[PDB]
Design a protein around this nucleic acid. Structure first.
Ligand SMILES: [Mg+2]
Ligand SMILES: [Mg+2]
Ligand SMILES: [Mg+2]
Ligand SMILES: [Mg+2]
Ligand SMILES: [Mg+2]
Ligand SMILES: [Mg+2]
Ligand SMILES: [Mg+2]
Ligand SMILES: [Mg+2]
Ligand SMILES: [Mg+2]
Ligand SMILES: [Mg+2]
Ligand SMILES: [Mg+2]
Lengths: 135, 29, 91, 97, 77, 252, 112
RNA sequence: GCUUGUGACGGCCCGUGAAAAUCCACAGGAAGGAAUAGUUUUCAUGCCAGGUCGUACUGAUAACCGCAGCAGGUCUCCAAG
RNA sequence: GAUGGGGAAGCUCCGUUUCAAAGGCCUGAUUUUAUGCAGGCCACCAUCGAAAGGGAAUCCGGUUAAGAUUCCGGAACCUGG
């Protein structure tokens, strides 16, 4: 079966966010005018939240758990497709082709994506997603 | 229970840095 | 045209040193200066780099080898002996 | 024997030679069977195994390196990974490959 | 050492505390082929460096000399 | 008389080893809890030339068991090893070319090099280019192992002595004739001042036992007592036989 | 041909006492002392001169800003782009095979 | 073209052709962290200070060694038709 | 080439990391006020040895009976505050 889908996790392999975890939100497979190649929109996380422990409480637990996210357009060549899965109903209509090519329009998405990922980390869902791949 | 995990370390030759044991029998007085 | 009937590479020494010591040096200078085939990348790019050291131009893997050649009859027959002794234990 | 099987594929059926194009054909999902030579590096051998198990493709191991997988498919060059898109005259799906 | 191209920037460095001295050089150059033209150069002395300007237009050379500070020591040539 | 040349070398003014460019002493790892119980893994970072030495050296890196850091060793490179390979050291290691194993754990007919005389000494026997010992039968009682050393001598050593597997790199180095003096000159330049060499029969009597004479001749027998003294020993020392050898060669 | 001297007491031609001839506004030739060339910094994995980093003599790197000494990536002015790429795969595939190990290896001891 | 510097290459070895001070970067996330303001002096500008000893001339058929203003001896850079 | 040690009737010889209890540093916590504890590492352990090896940073134009990359005029750059 064809694995590059809307609900699938991946690992970025090149460029600033290299060695970080993402989700392929919209696969533009067969070329384009701008970006003339097999490309894909992504929506992962830049800063991972730290190892909270049983000594910490109330205030420091909140500071240790803050997820600065990001969004990108990425070539299929610069991704590792993985067998893990993550849902994309929380930010399907927000991130789009029309969202990019506008400086002010990128923040509104990021603030909505940050809301999705911080809701997911609090109460353990997708642990592999919110843990740093170590190299 | 809520956020923190249980991921053990393996102190058994060539893996994990050995812990701070009591080394009183081997001290060069 | 072919330049020398017999001497070849040992012509540099001219008339000196005796014929058999030049003939012995031709033999071993044909071996060390030559290019050899790589184990990992599969190309005739392995070249000597001091006695015992053999590297690949591309792929960059170095290997420890003979003085004037990559493999030799001492290490060739030892390769089968270490292979055969382990087959008692493993197989 | 694998030598009789790959001989009939080159003239009639389709194929692709090399890593960049196997993974391009394996990401799309056109590959029926990928072949992997011996001397190919392990990190790449393990990634081709991982991309093949996601796409669901068989992984035969050619006995010998890239220099004799080229003569096996008939080309005059070293080739380190062969993906077979359309199996033509031969039958590499059901057989030992 | 340092040069400035913009004329709006140069007027700010004339009132930057340490800048006391300044100077206005007149030159005599030529361009294109035939007849020559009259060039001017305005230089100010900071503590670390000398900032300077190159104005080829003779029309705007008169406007810049008129708009300097009063306490600045301006030395011709 | 004077003081002979060979008496002069013991004071070591100009007869010391020239050792600027050397890489380092070529020992094994220090024997610890990790090597005499399980095993421990290291990577060969690069193999490299060493001055005044026929064989190449391997800079081999391990990780320290008792504190967070790395440890760099210098092994003598065996004929087979390549950079990036994993060297597996200790007791429970497989029978592979480059791994270091205790002489008890290998079977018979096994070919090891850079082997300890007594356990924990870190290198001793078979360290030149193209050398090795053969393990030739074991002894379960008193844990002793019987071996064959490069000279043909048959020793019995401890079974807990360690020994890296395979022959040493740089084999067949003495086949190619040097041809000229310039090549001998450069060889010794990076070892010690022992070249070139003048014959004793060409000196005056103050300088040697073989001096003087109206022809060049030794004059008395060249074979000399085990228990002569400093100044008398020059020639063949404790020679049980002499002359060009006939019959079968080598040790039985 | 107007000949020229050294400008410092060291009169021998070493690596640190090099000379360049230079024409001046007085209209004479004159010697100028040249400094030693900087090498490129190397990657600590392959050994390639690594791109987007300045080439200066080592104490110069104290004066310069942070942009001139790095790139924006994991292992900035330390490993090259190809080296980081590879150890991200290798870190992932071994740790993917580590989960595939413990799924199969636990079932091995369980069903025996 | 001459002198010199530099760049990518190629030959040669049983010769594979110093070290240390010093300066940087990365991995790591300790600690400190924000909205009526902190963090930045690795961005720009601005203020202050930088001791001690040597520094003249010869460098050779007259300033050095050779009993001397001795046909000897004494390391090195620049180089016109 | 000192030290700790060990030789030597002694002038002294050996040895330089050695069978030795071998020495320094960062924040705070403070508001008797100067550092009382919080705890972390480091075992690196004398020192001498290059006016051609390594090494932070300067140029032009003027000037004297005899000085200058050192003075004067202009324009710079480092290092520590
Ligand atoms: Mg002789
Ligand atoms: Mg002799
Ligand atoms: Mg004589
Ligand atoms: Mg006698
Ligand atoms: Mg005598
Ligand atoms: Mg005679
Ligand atoms: Mg110097
Ligand atoms: Mg002078
Ligand atoms: Mg003079
Ligand atoms: Mg000193
Ligand atoms: Mg003067």
């Amino acid at each position: 079966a064809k694995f590059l889908k809307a609900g699938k996790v991946a690992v970025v392999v090149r460029g600033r966010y290299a060695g970080k975890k993402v989700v392929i939100v919209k696969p533009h497979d067969e070329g384009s005018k701008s970006h003339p190649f097999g490309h894909a929109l992504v929506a992962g996380i830049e800063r991972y939240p730290l190892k909270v422990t049983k000594k910490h409480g109330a205030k420091k637990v909140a500071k240790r758990t803050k997820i600065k996210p990001f969004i990108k357009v990425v070539n299929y060549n610069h991704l590792l497709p993985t067998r893990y899965t993550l849902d994309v109903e929380a930010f399907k209509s927000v991130v789009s082709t029309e969202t990019f090519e506008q400086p002010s329009q990128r923040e509104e998405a990021k603030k909505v994506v940050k809301k999705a990922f911080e809701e997911r980390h609090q109460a353990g869902k997708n642990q592999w997603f919110f843990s740093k791949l170590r190299f | 229970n809520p956020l923190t995990h249980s991921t053990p370390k393996n102190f058994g030759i060539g893996q994990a840095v050995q812990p701070k044991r009591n080394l009183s029998r081997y001290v060069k007085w | 045209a072919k330049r020398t009937k017999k001497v070849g590479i040992t012509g540099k020494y001219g008339v000196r040193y005796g014929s058999s010591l030049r003939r012995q040096v031709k033999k071993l200078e044909i071996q060390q200066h030559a290019r050899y085939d790589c184990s990992f990348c599969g190309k005739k790019t392995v070249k000597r780099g001091a006695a015992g050291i053999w590297t690949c131009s591309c792929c960059k893997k170095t290997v420890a080898g003979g003085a004037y050649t990559v493999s030799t009859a001492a290490a060739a027959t030892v390769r089968s002996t270490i292979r055969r002794l382990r087959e008692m234990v493993e197989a | 024997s694998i030598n009789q099987k790959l001989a009939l594929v080159i003239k009639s059926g389709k194929y692709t030679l090399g890593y960049k194009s196997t993974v391009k054909s394996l990401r799309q999902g056109k590959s029926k069977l990928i072949i992997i030579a011996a001397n190919t590096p392990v990190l790449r051998k393990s990634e081709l195994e991982y991309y093949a198990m996601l796409s669901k493709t068989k992984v035969y191991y050619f006995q010998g390196g890239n220099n004799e997988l080229g003569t096996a498919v008939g080309k005059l060059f070293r080739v380190g990974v062969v993906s077979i898109l359309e199996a033509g005259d031969s039958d590499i799906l059901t057989t030992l490959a | 050492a340092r040069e400035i191209t913009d004329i709006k920037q140069f007027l700010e460095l004339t009132r930057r505390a340490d800048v006391k001295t300044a100077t206005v050089k007149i030159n005599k150059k030529l361009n294109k082929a035939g007849k020559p033209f009259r060039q001017t150069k305005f230089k100010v002395r900071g503590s670390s460096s000398l900032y300077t300007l190159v104005i080829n237009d003779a029309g705007k050379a008169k406007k810049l000399i008129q708009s300097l500070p009063p306490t600045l020591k301006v030395n011709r040539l | 008389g004077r003081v002979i040349r060979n008496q002069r070398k013991g004071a070591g003014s100009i007869f010391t080893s020239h050792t600027r460019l050397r890489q380092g002493a070529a020992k094994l790892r220090t024997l610890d809890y990790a090597e005499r119980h399980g095993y421990i893994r290291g990577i060969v970072k690069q193999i490299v030339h060493d001055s005044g030495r026929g064989a190449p050296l391997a800079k081999v890196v391990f990780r320290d068991p008792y504190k967070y850091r790395l440890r760099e060793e210098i092994f003598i490179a065996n004929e087979g090893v390549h950079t990036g390979q994993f060297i597996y050291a200790g007791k429970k290691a497989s029978l592979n070319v480059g791994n270091v194993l205790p002489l008890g754990s290998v079977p018979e007919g096994t070919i090891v090099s850079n082997v300890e005389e007594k356990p924990g000494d870190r290198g001793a026997l078979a360290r030149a280019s193209g050398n090795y010992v053969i393990i030739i039968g074991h002894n379960p009682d008193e844990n002793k192992t019987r071996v064959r050393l490069p000279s043909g001598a048959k020793k019995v050593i401890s079974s807990d002595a360690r020994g890296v597997i395979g022959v040493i790199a740089g084999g067949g180095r003495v086949d190619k004739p040097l041809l000229k003096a310039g090549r001998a000159f450069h060889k010794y330049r990076l070892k010690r001042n022992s070249w070139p060499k003048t014959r004793g029969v060409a000196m005056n009597p103050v300088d040697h036992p073989h001096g003087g004479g109206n022809h060049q001749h030794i004059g008395k027998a060249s074979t000399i007592s085990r228990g002569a003294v400093s100044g008398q020993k020059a020639g063949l020392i404790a020679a049980r036989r002499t002359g060009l050898l006939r019959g079968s060669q080598k040790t039985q | 041909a107007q000949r020229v001297t050294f400008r410092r007491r060291n009169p021998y031609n070493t690596r640190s006492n090099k000379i360049k001839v230079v024409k001046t506004p007085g209209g004479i030739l004159r010697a100028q002392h040249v400094k030693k060339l900087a090498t490129r910094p190397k990657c600590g994995d392959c050994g390639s001169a690594l791109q987007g980093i300045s080439t200066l003599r080592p104490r110069q790197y104290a004066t310069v800003s942070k942009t001139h000494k790095t790139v924006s990536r994991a292992y900035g002015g330390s490993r090259c782009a190809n080296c980081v790429k590879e150890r991200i795969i290798r870190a992932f595939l071994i740790e993917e095979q580590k989960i595939v190990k413990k799924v199969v290896k636990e079932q091995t001891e369980a069903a025996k």
